[PDB]
Amino acid sequence: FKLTIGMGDLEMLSSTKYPVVFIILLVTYIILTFVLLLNMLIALMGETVGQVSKESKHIWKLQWATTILDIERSFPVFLRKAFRSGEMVTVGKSSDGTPDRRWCFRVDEVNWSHW
Amino acid sequence: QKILFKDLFRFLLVYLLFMIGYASALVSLLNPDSETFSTFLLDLFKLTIGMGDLEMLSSTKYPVVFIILLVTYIILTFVLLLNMLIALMGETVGQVSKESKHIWKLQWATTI
């Protein structure tokens, strides 16, 4: 590990015979370490961003929606009832003539095409 | 200028968060006290650069856990640097590659 960092001792490199193979193998060691770092970097810069383009937006949407839903769930039933989205719009007469009284949700749009 | 102001605030915030957390934990566990806090704080950046001392690394017990934690600190600093690189590279291709001409045009027009 010490030689991996870069600070090392030359005396112990050739202290136990076979110096040429030691030097060659240690050089290939550093080359392979650099290649492994590049192996991270290639997928990090290009492919990970390729997933970031769309899948990261989708996972953001899921991550935000699940936090909203968990926050809603931790609240008690009556508190959620107080913080209930949508209006209380009645729709019309039922089969017996009673009003629907259904918790609808109004969204507004602008359309210049159909008249 | 996006590097120097726009994302430098976020990068600095994350870096200072990690640095203060790790340095506070390390100084809290170590024992000899305000001066020692500053000495170990500057020693943290000294080890961050790469030039450090082995004797003070194992100065106060628990050698394995501090070795692992310092390795993780260096790894996370490298990860923050590469996160800066990755955030600059690729994420804003669709933005920069099209908006560079537009912002040139806006700046040139407002200069005129």
Next chain:
Amino acid sequence: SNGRNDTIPVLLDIAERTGNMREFINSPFRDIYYRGQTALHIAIERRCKHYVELLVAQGADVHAQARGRFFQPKDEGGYFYFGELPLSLAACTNQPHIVNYLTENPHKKADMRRQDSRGNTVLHALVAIADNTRENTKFVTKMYDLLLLKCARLFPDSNLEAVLNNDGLSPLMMAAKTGKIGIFQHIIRREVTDEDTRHLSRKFKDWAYGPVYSSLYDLSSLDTCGEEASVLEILVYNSKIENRHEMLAVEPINELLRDKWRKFGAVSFYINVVSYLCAMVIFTLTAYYQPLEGTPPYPYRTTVDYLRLAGEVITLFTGVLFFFTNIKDLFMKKCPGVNSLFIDGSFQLLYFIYSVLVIVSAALYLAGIEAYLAVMVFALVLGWMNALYFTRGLKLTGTYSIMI
């Protein structure tokens, strides 16, 4: 032969002279691979209206359930699941005339509200066979609307959609958690302009003033506040990975989520952030002020000791709260695997590790004198890397944490 086998009427005549006409009409297959299927199912599948008409005339059972191993969902070792019912089979092979004859005949009418062994009604089966392809949805939605309107006209007292199968689902929720956007959007946005049965529509037009049209949707089942298994929770959690992102983009779903945000969702998340940061700085201050000389428990006599004890107990309270929340979360929903761990599962995994670290630190503090500092410091280490959880609020920081 060319859609007509001339020997069938004479064979039935021979049977009725023999005295086993009813015994002969509905002869169910006995092998495990084709159990339940009768001649009526074969006639319906062959798309021969005349033969099914002539077969039901003498008393063919229009409720015989083809529940063999061949008629099972593809995920349960089968080839074709049509709903285990002759009417469901007729509606699941795009034969509106066969459905019209089966539902309206003088001989024997099969009510569309009947449920199979699985509990799936005709609408549930039609949702089950539905695909995301345009051509399949093209007639699946048409048949769904036809069946629902016919059931409403025949039985105005009840609604065919309101029935629950043996799994507690409805056609809308079944389509939501199965991953059928084609019929999910149609069910959500359907509107019945006919005045006789306009009540079974989920999108009305409130008012219009020039080019400003206000259409109001129905959330009677999309948001019920933990009372009727809201479709939103099922879609976010129980839906399949591939179609969830684009099936969460339906017209009244995105608006409902944003309204929940701006209502209680938007600042509840922020409060969480500030409380987490305050508790965390309290944790760090308690960490730094712990004396390094002495075996715990320490003697608490000074005001500094009182503050340290308060910090320790508030840390334990936060840790046990996080542990309880994570345990309830893991108990409510089954443990996910690939394609769902990166959504949140990794993050409450790290928070579970955090709670475990706090608990074991307290356990050592009770008796042990050594290694308390190490485990508590490592808990602090894992703590400030969990601050990346609160990055979804900002557009960029969420990804900044996700790639980390």
Next chain:
Amino acid sequence: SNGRNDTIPVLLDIAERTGNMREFINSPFRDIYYRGQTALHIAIERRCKHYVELLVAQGADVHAQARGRFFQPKDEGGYFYFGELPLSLAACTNQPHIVNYLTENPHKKADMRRQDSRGNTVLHALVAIADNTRE
């Protein structure tokens, strides 16, 4: 009903018998949410040329300003801003025939240069309602 309510001529005849016909034509809404809107605005918005003709003939105020909170730009808590004027309203809903009738009629012509409370003329309102969409 189907674009025609037969009660309008009868109501106008009753009003002119009882002597408040002019008062009856231009009755502005009093609520904060719809202030200023008159029957002429409703007739124009309903796209009924026959009723706007039959309503302005007796002296409908063709310059009544619909300046309620509903007739405000979307940036100021509103749903539809058309210029707060019957001519601007007719021009802002793609009604060339009603604009032609309002600008050229024997009874009472609304000049196109008139400005609302905001000062926006007909062209300003038509710019305001415009979108970047092709249609």
